[PDB]
Structure 1
Amino acid sequence: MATIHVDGKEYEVNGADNLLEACLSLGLDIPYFCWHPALGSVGACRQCAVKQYQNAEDTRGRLVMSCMTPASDGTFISIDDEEAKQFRESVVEWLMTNHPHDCPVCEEGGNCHLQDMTVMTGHSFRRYRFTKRTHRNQDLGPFISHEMNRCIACYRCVRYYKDYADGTDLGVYGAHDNVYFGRPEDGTLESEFSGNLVEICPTGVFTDKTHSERYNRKWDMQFAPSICQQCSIGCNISPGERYGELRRIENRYNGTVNHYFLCDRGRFGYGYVNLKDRPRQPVQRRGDDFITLNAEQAMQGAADILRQSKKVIGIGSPRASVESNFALRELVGEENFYTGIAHGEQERLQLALKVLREGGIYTPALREIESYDAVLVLGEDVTQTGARVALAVRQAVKGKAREMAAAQKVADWQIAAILNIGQRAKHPLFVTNVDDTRLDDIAAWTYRAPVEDQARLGFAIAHALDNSAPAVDGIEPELQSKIDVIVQALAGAKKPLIISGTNAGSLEVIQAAANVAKALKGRGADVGITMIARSVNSMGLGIMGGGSLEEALTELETGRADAVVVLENDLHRHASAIRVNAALAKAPLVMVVDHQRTAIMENAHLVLSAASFAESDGTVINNEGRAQRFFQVYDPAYYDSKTVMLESWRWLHSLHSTLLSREVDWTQLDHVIDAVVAKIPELAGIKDAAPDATFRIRGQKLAREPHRYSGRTAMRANISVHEPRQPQDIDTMFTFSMEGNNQPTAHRSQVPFAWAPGWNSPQAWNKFQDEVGGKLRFGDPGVRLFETSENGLDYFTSVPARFQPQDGKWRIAPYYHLFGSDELSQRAPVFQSRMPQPYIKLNPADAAKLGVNAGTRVSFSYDGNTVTLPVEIAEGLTAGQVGLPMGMSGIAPVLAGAHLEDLKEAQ
């Protein structure tokens, strides 16, 4: 767009960018701290100084800040000007005057932007001889640690936590050189995106406590490109391992999905992988005797029983991969494969898929959501189910300021100006839930009502946008006025966005959202539809299909099925525990393939030690239908040779072979992928999700370990002074070593970790992108399985009737918790403190009627079981409804929409 002249050499850059962003994207190295590709430019640290000349004849220019200077055409700048170099070194020296001598004992060592810039500025000699300022630290909760002494006052944390994530508990206090960055008081950071501070802070003030316990330097970590498995958003992550334990989860830049930010559940909810109660070897239960078997013995014995079984059924899971679920389907037969999900959950998931695959409306990617000008969330508590979508919705709401600023011809990178021009102006946002939501602060209106009433609102908005849409009866004049504001806001929007999901527990809320989106599409609008699922591969299981858990249980209950192979499913989160336990007790053979110790395992005849995402390779499909491949991070048997933790697809494929040929076949991942694409045409893009195992970079495999990995001849010396053979990988293109390629210019899309000479901090992603803040140079990884259909679905004419409280029955309202609702994350120990204490929420009036107050324990019966829970008062909750923490052990997510009966004060 514009022609600039840096140090004589001429370059073509976008005039809409700043010189820092432009030159960094050209590969030129300019030190910086306060500027962030996502937080914009402020001009505080004054580190990106560059000399600027007025013309080609100017020999005496001026020092300007590249981040606050436009990359205009005809710009003459010099990064190597002696004065610029001297000033840039002086800025670092001033920051080093009051900097603590705690490199050896800080957790950012080797991953510190400040260390990288000190060296880049060539400042190795101290002249300052006076005292260094000190600050007392604060408690910031169980995930983030505080060390204010290591601060450089770049203001990045407050700009991200408050201006991007919209948090309210982080701030800047004090004045002059006594500026302090932290909470107004000691306590837990309340932002669901507080973890991103560890990568945002260029120093070691904010660090990860989950890693600090078993801390290791970045050069000693074995990393693998993986997809987060805690919700359905499918964020790219870089899990790291040392000594056979997952040590930390870092963000993997996906310019199409999570870009630079993750959420707390995915960043700090991995400890379940390091649980010491996990199955490590195949075990058989003979009466009350447990026998540890080997892979070969386990396959032969199991196939022998399966060969003589009348009907072998298989139960899959939304947690399992596409390959793992497919392997079970082939082992038991498509007719005998059942999705381990409740009938209702499957119906809602399939309806959500039909909308995205046959609705004729585009489904946006996580980053694309930040470009819509109006958002309607129907029944989905995103902040607690798909947190990263809530962060994207926040950036979308901030568009009004950006539009207002562009009208005044203000540069897109000048955030301060954009914010002042904007003030409290925001794009229209409307959220509906059974009670309060975390997005209520930026929402124009929040409709707190039973799921049925929330759906009626959707049908109503649709009728108002298109009379052809089914009309709703019983809307009170007061609500109608509120509905009109939403209709005008969506009608006036140029790019509207409708967001729903299966977490509401209502099929109507998904149908209502489909009608609203169809209405806006008919009015010729760039409408977008987003559906939030519940697990990492919920959409994948939905595309594959199968019977329900209820139908699988009935087979075992009628006795028609004698053998049940359960795959990575506890079954108690999808069906009654009494029913599942009884059904599994009538089966001659019960085999469980899971990587976690579940309750159903207690009465299983055989338990196969499956691997977790860290020790496995496979493909998962996110809510947008993007098939993304995860790769094995480390070999589980490297340190403990006895460990026999194999991928679920490998276990099931080998069993199928032993059942048909009496011989074991541990195939390669590519073969299983080829089988899926051939048998299931819908899951065909999974082949292009990532290159095969034969992919190489100039003959070199991709590497998982940094080039300075240490301990090669001493890490396992305790077990044997004889160094073990490098674990070999036949499934992926990654080597379990450093003898591979991790070049920032390697023609690939899967980057295990970001490192570039001179850039050891997360700022090294800049060298792996086409343009800083853009996309990976050779494309972002992942393939959308389906495109927008040419034709759409007919309007759903099933408007539900208004909710009516019924004496005795108590509608269970779904309350979700980022910390607690997910199954695996709750197993992680660091989450115990963050997770909420057990409760039941009641409308103040209902509590008064039952003569109970806050704290009063109340007894109630569900599946023939009396449960006691402390009462919490929820004013927003409508009467006739009770609030329960969905997903929390005991409260199965299926309880949503069910009814409690004998609700009374306990004892």
Structure 2
Amino acid sequence: ATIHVDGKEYEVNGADNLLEACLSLGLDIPYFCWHPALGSVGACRQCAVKQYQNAEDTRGRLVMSCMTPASDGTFISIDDEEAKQFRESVVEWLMTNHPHDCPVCEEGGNCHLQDMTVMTGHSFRRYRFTKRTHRNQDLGPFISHEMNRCIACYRCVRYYKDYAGGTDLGVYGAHDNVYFGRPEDGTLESEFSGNLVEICPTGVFTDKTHSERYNRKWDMQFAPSICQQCSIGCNISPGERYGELRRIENRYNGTVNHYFLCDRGRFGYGYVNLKDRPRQPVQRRGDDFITLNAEQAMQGAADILRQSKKVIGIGSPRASVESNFALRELVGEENFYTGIAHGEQERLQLALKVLREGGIYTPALREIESYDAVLVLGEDVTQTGARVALAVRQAVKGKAREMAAAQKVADWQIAAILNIGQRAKHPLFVTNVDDTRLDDIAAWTYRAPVEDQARLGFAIAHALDNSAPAVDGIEPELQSKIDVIVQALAGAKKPLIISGTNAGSLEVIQAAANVAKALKGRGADVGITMIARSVNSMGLGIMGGGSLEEALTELETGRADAVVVLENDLHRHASATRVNAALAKAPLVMVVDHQRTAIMENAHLVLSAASFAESDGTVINNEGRAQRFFQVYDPAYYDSKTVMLESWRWLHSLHSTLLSREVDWTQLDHVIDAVVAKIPELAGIKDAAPDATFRIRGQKLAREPHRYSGRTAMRANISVHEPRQPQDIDTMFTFSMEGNNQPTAHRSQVPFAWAPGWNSPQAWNKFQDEVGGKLRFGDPGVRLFETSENGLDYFTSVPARFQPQDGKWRIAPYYHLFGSDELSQRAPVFQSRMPQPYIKLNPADAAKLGVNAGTRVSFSYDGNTVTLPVEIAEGLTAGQVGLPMGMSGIAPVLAGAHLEDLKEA
């Protein structure tokens, strides 16, 4: 299409509306109610331009550019005097009731309303009357509510309801008393409620966790990092100030997590700021804890390692690729053990084999929203991979999108799309041990044990393709529902099969692979998604090694006298008693970690590693994409006695001191090149980010904004002399403003979005080639593996039905978004949000034991009698007992595990 803006010709896409087309060209139109992800509704009337019928037209007409299609040969004007005066009048009308709140408002300096008030040039107030006020609600521990600052742009309700699928937020009231919130005080129920702080263009919804230790946006030090709280790998911008992590903002990745995080990623960063973290290396001498510097800790550790006869290394899926590789190099490939259980490692390896050998394309998180039918097998995605659940909701609304497109309704006119697609939606079939949070939009929900879910998947694969193995013992109504699933999936142009390793069953993953193969054989454009557990689970699976049980037997039999545990608490992957016995038997335990774990009581040496905020590295997400996270701040800048290094730096210097009796604090690119040379399956991680020599016209990339303040006074209480600026030899970023963050810079790693006149999160529009699309010059991250030409075979190992045996109790996993991730549990703000641990029981089983709802029962596993109060779960299958995974004492290795001595306390 061709448009003429202010007499200048432009070539745009005709399917877009005028506002997004003009913002993609760099033109500045003020706007409030439109969002690139939510569509156009034409409420705020801020985006007004003047449209003319032809070139020889002088009068024109004011139109909303967000609601005007960018048709071919469209003549408009933004800088028309009438349009400018109307946009100024809209800003003024918004400003009549706005509170005098900017100094004491957390959105100041990050406010879209401030930016558009300045952009319209409106700075004189001629309104002399009273301003309306509102009471505020309590929205829980995460979101702070300030209703006075609202401009009634309806972004919150549209996002939270039409996009996120939440139910408890809404718009109440009338003419100019419109209220946006919950009907009563209470916590926002959605797992994606945290994106309201970026969706809201004003200070109504604010980050309460940030509002505790508040600082303005110009005062933050930012870095482009990857969220470490599950395997999705959403791009984040951690921002720090005064040596502590202050905020997690969304970082735009048009291929992964474009505008939206989940609440675990956004608010579960509080473990970084804990005061019990290791900040110096500590050596045990009898009962004494001697604090060492880097050099003497490395010398003593390498000497004791040299006197040892066999050193084993226990990695972790929390650690980066470089740190796991450095441990593998230090202890040797044959002595390296992945720090996960044998069943967990088997499920992880099977998921990786399906992803990179099954011949079926695995979509990115953004690409999930374009699929026509979704089958989720055994994976509670809302609690384990939440952004996948959000993308599944978008893919479900794709049917309403297609129905509206059949009636020649444009894709940005969201109200008409929702009107045409009333309740018609794409087929969604979820299977779990109980009800999921996707049940409100699911076409069918199957509450069954993991064997029965696997048998359902194998039956679906057999009915789609008769070459697949059959299932014997299917009930006729279950067969009818299976047939419903089969005709829904076979009629889909782009079916999607989602599973993962959190189900605790190998057969569920095998059944999902069988369904995907059966759909691939029919010619469908099938995609497969596997949800892992931790941030670098796929990286640890690609690296390979032994299981944690093998390392425990190596420690117990005395074949290994030295163990180096990297970023692993060892209690989430094995029993605590056996781990404690093996670590007490081992004469040398060296724990390289950044969190105070329980295994440092018996550890001979504790190396104060860096977390993601204080380190660089690479992580492989659930779809096999290598992503580089960068260090946010130097921990030794404010506390000069802090020796907190990267884990790969610790292990590489330990290897160098073990070999040549000399420390070597290496560079990140050297470890990256070592990974690429030694492990060819991880050769793609070289291209995740450019090396430390990367420059933009000769200068580095800035971590902090141009107006970063207090540089001669933040450390003046320690010493009036300004310290040396921390040098960054590992990466292309600098710990200063002396760098580049231009939106037109040829790069893909963007620490934060800021353009002049756009201080809000809306500056990501300036950082994209087209708004709502990809990052300009490509999104960061590279897929490690391509789709194989030939797939796997059908898995003939069809499990039997779940048999409830007396005495035994099958543990059904119950994951929680706030409580299943270890570091997220360590965050103090999650302690109020996380629920009290309830053991879930069937009504029939609770009647059999005679226990009611709320009474405490005690059960023993691995000789550990623990007590929990009972919650009645009707959707659970009899013979199963539900356990909340990741919680206090309930390790996630209990999925699929049997249970003994379930008795009332």
Superposition TM-score, scaled by structure 2 size: 1.00
Aligned equivalents of 2:17 and 2:893: distance in 1?
51
Listed one character per residue, the Cα deviations across residues 655-701 of structure 1 (whole Å, up to 9, x for unaligned) are 00000000000000000000000000000000000000000000010
CA distance in 2, matches of 1:696, 1:897: 51
**Aligned-pair distance for 1:159?**
0.2
For residues 222 and 576 of structure 2, the distance between their equivalents in structure 1, rounded to whole angstroms, comes to 38
Alignment partners' CA distance in 2, 1:838 and 1:418: 42
The equivalent residue for 2:806 is 807
TM-fit CA distance, 1:613: 0.2
The alpha-carbon deviation at position 7 of structure 1 amounts to 0.3
Shift of 1:429: 0.3
Partner of 2:759: 760
For the residues of structure 1 that align with 2:278 and 2:458, how far apart are their CA atoms?
49
Shift of 1:588: 1.1
CA–CA distance in 2 between the matches of 1:152 and 1:721?
45
Q: Once the 2 structures are TM-superposed, how far is the Cα of residue 353 of structure 1 from its aligned partner?
A: 0.2
How is 1:472-871 mapped onto 2 (pairs within 5 angstroms)? 472-871=471-870
Task: Map Cα deviations across residues 417-441 of structure 1 (whole Å, 9 max, x no partner).
Answer: 0000000000000000000100000
After TM superposition, give the deviation of residue 901 of structure 1 in Å. 1.0
Using the TM superposition, give the Cα deviation of residue 845 of structure 1 relative to its aligned residue in structure 2, in angstroms.
Answer: 0.5
Task: Name 2:201's counterpart in structure 1.
Answer: 202
Superposed displacement of residue 264, structure 1: 0.1
Displacement after TM superposition at 1:889 (Å)? 2.0
* SS at structure 2 position matched to 1:902: strand
Deviations 1:690-714 (A, max 9, x none): 0000000000100001000000000
**SS of corresponding position for 1:882:** strand
1:839 deviation in Å?
A: 1.4
SS of alignment partner, residue 181 of structure 1: strand
CA distance in structure 2 between the aligned counterparts of 1:588 and 1:164, rounded to whole angstroms: 56
TM-aligned CA deviation for residue 859 of structure 1: 1.3
Q: Secondary structure at the match of 1:129?
A: coil
How far residue 886 of structure 1 moved from its aligned partner, in angstroms, is 0.6
Q: Distance in 2 between matches of 1:357 and 1:311?
A: 34
Q: 1:838, CA displacement in angstroms?
A: 1.4
The SS at the match of 2:883 is: strand
User: CA shift at 1:861, angstroms?
Assistant: 1.1
Distance in structure 2 (CA, Å) of the matches to 1:358 and 1:903: 42
Q: Following the alignment from structure 1 to structure 2, what is the Cα–Cα distance between the partners of residues 514 and 777?
A: 35
Give the deviation of 1:514 after TM superposition: 0.2
CA distance in 1, matches of 2:165, 2:655: 52
Q: Give the 3-state SS of the residue equivalent to 2:645 in structure 1.
A: coil
Could you tell me how far apart the structure 1 residues matched to 2:885 and 2:443 are?
27
SS in 2 for 1:820: coil
| Structure 1 counterpart of 2:468 | 469
Q: Please give the alpha-carbon distance, in whole angstroms, between the structure 2 residues aligned to 1:767 and 1:860.
A: 57
User: Aligned partners of 1:859, 1:526: CA distance in 2, in Å?
Assistant: 50
Question: CA-to-partner distance for each residue in 1:275-328, whole Å, 9 max, x for gaps?
Answer: 000000000011111100110000111111111101000000000000000000
Q: What is the SS of the residue equivalent to 2:825?
A: helix
Inter-partner Cα distance in structure 2 for 1:301 and 1:5: 72
Deviation at 1:591, TM superposition (A): 0.3
Q: Deviations over 1:796-838 (max 9, x none)?
A: 0000000010110110101000000000000000000111101
What is the CA deviation profile of residues 179-218 of structure 1, one whole-angstrom value per residue up to 9, with x for unaligned ones?
A: 1000011000000000000000000000000000100000
Distance 1:756 1:781 in 2: 20
SS in 2 for 1:725: coil
2:440 & 2:608 partners in 1: Cα distance? 46
Deviations 1:878-902 (A, max 9, x none): 0110001011120000011111111
Total equivalences in the alignment: 905
Task: Describe the superposition over 1:689-746 as per-residue Cα deviations: whole angstroms up to 9, x where unpaired.
Answer: 0000000000010000100000000000000000001000000000000000000000
**1:639 Cα offset (Å):** 0.6
Aligned with 1:178: secondary structure? Answer: coil
Shift of 1:515: 0.3
CA positional deviation for 1:564: 0.1
CA distance in 2, matches of 1:740, 1:178: 47
Structure 1 residue 609: Cα displacement: 0.4
| In structure 2, C-alpha distance between the alignment counterparts of 1:620 and 1:30, rounded to whole Å | 38
What is the alpha-carbon distance in structure 1 between the residues aligned to residue 596 and residue 865 of structure 2? 26
SS at match of 1:791: coil
In 1: Cα distance, 2:337 partner to 2:399 partner: 47
1:38 and 1:556 mapped to 2: Cα distance?
53
User: Partners in 1 of 2:356 and 2:34 — Cα distance?
Assistant: 40
Q: Give deviations 1:493-549, integer Å, cap 9, x for gaps.
A: 010000000000000000000000000000000000000000000000000000110
Number of the residue aligned with 1:330: 329
Tell me the TM-score normalized by structure 1: 1.00
> Which string of whole-angstrom CA distances, capped at 9 and with x for unpartnered residues, describes residues 326-379 of structure 1?
000000000000000000000000000000010000000000000000000000
SS of the residue 1:439 aligns to: coil
CA offset digits 1:380-422 (Å, max 9, x no partner) = 0000000000000000000111111111100110000000000
After TM superposition, give the deviation of residue 33 of structure 1 in Å. 0.1
Q: Matches of 1:857 and 1:100 in 2, distance apart? A: 51
Q: Which runs of 5+ in 1 are unaligned?
A: none
Q: 1:445 maps to what in 2? A: 444
SS in 2 for 1:68: coil
CA distance in 2, matches of 1:161, 1:845: 37
Q: Distance in 1 between matches of 2:376 and 2:284?
A: 49
* Alignment partner, residue 307 of structure 1: 306
Partner SS state of residue 457, structure 1: helix
Specify the alignment match of 1:70 in structure 2.
69
Give the aligned partner of residue 256 of structure 2.
257
For 2:473 and 2:693, how far apart are their aligned partners in 1? Answer: 63
Deviations 1:755-801 (A, max 9, x none): 00000000000001010000011000000000000000000000000
Shift of residue 865, structure 1, vs aligned partner: 1.5
2:16 alignment partner in structure 1: 17
Secondary structure of 2:114's counterpart equals helix
| Secondary structure at the counterpart of residue 748 of structure 2 | coil
Write the distance in 2 (CA, Å) between the matches of 1:325 and 1:63: 60
> What CA deviation, in whole Å up to 9, does each residue of 1:125-145 have, x standing for no partner?
000000000000000000000
CA displacement at 1:468 relative to structure 2: 0.5
Distance in 2 separating the partners of 1:121 and 1:544: 55
Distance in 2 of aligned mates of 1:859 and 1:89: 67
What per-residue deviation string (whole Å, max 9, x for no partner) do you get for residues 613-655 of structure 1? 0000000000000000000000000011000000000000000
Cα deviation, residue 860, structure 1:
1.1
Offset, 1:552: 0.2
Cα distance, 1:36 vs. partner? 0.2
SS in 1 for 2:350: helix
Superposition deviation, residue 856 in structure 1:
1.0
State the shift of 1:867 in Å. Answer: 1.1
Q: Distance in 2 between matches of 1:859 and 1:625?
A: 41
Q: Which residue of 1 aligns with 2:58?
A: 59
C-alpha displacement at 1:146, in angstroms?
0.5
- Which sections of structure 2, spanning at least 5 residues, go unmatched? none
Counterpart secondary structure, 1:85: helix
Point out 4+ residue stretches in structure 1 off by more than 2 angstroms. none
What displacement does 1:239 show?
0.1
Counterpart Cα distance in 2 of 1:472 and 1:11: 60
Q: Deviations over 1:20-55 (max 9, x none)?
A: 000000000000000000000000010000011101
**1: CA distance between counterparts of 2:200 and 2:131?**
21
Whole-Å separation in 2 of the counterparts to 1:53 and 1:557: 83
Once residues 679 and 14 of structure 2 are traced to their aligned partners in structure 1, the CA distance between those partners, rounded to angstroms, is 48
